[PDB]
Amino acid sequence: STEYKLVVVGADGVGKSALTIQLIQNHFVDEYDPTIEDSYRKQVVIDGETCLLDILDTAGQSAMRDQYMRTGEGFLCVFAINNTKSFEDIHHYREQIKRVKDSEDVPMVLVGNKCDLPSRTVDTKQAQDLARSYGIPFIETSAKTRQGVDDAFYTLVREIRKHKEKMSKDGKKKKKK
Ligand SMILES: Nc1nc2c(ncn2[C@@H]2O[C@H](COP(=O)(O)OP(=O)(O)O)[C@@H](O)[C@H]2O)c(=O)[nH]1
Ligand SMILES: c1ccc2[nH]cnc2c1
Numbered sequence: 519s520t521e522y523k524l525v526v527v528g529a530d531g532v533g534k535s536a537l538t539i540q541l542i543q544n545h546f547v548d549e550y551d552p553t554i555e556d557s558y559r560k561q562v563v564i565d566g567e568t569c570l571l572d573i574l575d576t577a578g579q580s581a582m583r584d585q586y587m588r589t590g591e592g593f594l595c596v597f598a599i600n601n602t603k604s605f606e607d608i609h610h611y612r613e614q615i616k617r618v619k620d621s622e623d624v625p626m627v628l629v630g631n632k633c634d635l636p637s638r639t640v641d642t643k644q645a646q647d648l649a650r651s652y653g654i655p656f657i658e659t660s661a662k663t664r665q666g667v668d669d670a671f672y673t674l675v676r677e678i679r680k681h682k683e684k685m686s687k688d689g690k691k692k693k694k695k
């Protein structure tokens with residue numbers, strides 16, 4: 519019943535596509551194609567509610583980017599736990615989102631992907647601390663094993679819901695419930 523526009527963002531090679539394909543098709547693509555942008559739809563029930571997920575799997579870091587950022591209601595901000603630059607990139611994606619959507623309050627979830635790998639270069643604590651600073655959830659995932667995949671996406675839907683209710687009551691000006 520309720521539709522949610524989700525946008526998966528992050529540096530090339532962090533597993534944005536693999537995560538999305540795991541959610542939709544339930545298999546791991548060890549393959550690759552970092553250039554194209556796919557979108558997928560999925561009907562799921564979350565907390566007893568029927569959700570239509572419309573997910574954009576981005577490719578890159580323009581007059582295409584701005585539109586999809588305006589369209590998106592929530593953002594899955596993905597880095598890979600063995601890719602320091604991709605973790606650092608999160609700051610820049612967040613700033614870009616807040617600017618395009620002209621808001622300090624945008625539903626987001628921080629996702630640390632590839633947690634199946636050894637010798638991570640980005641510690642769980644540093645990612646947890648960042649998420650705490652932003653006031654957003656942090657979820658660790660492996661698109662390879664499928665661990666945390668549903669949780670990441672469902673958590674983002676829950677964040678969007680909380681924002682919806684927060685907006686109606688706002689901080690001041692109007693109030694509601
Ligand atoms: N070990 C491991 N490899 C992954 C994971 N997610 C993606 N990959 C691999 O990382 C490479 C890039 O993944 P891809 O989905 O194309 O990244 P994208 O550019 O962010 O969309 C591919 O070879 C994937 O098979 C993961 O969770 N664990
Ligand atoms: C943003 C979010 C989801 C989308 N699905 C198709 N285009 C999109 C843009």
Ligand SMILES: [Mg+2]
Nearest residue numbers: 534535551552
């Ligand atoms: Mg991709």
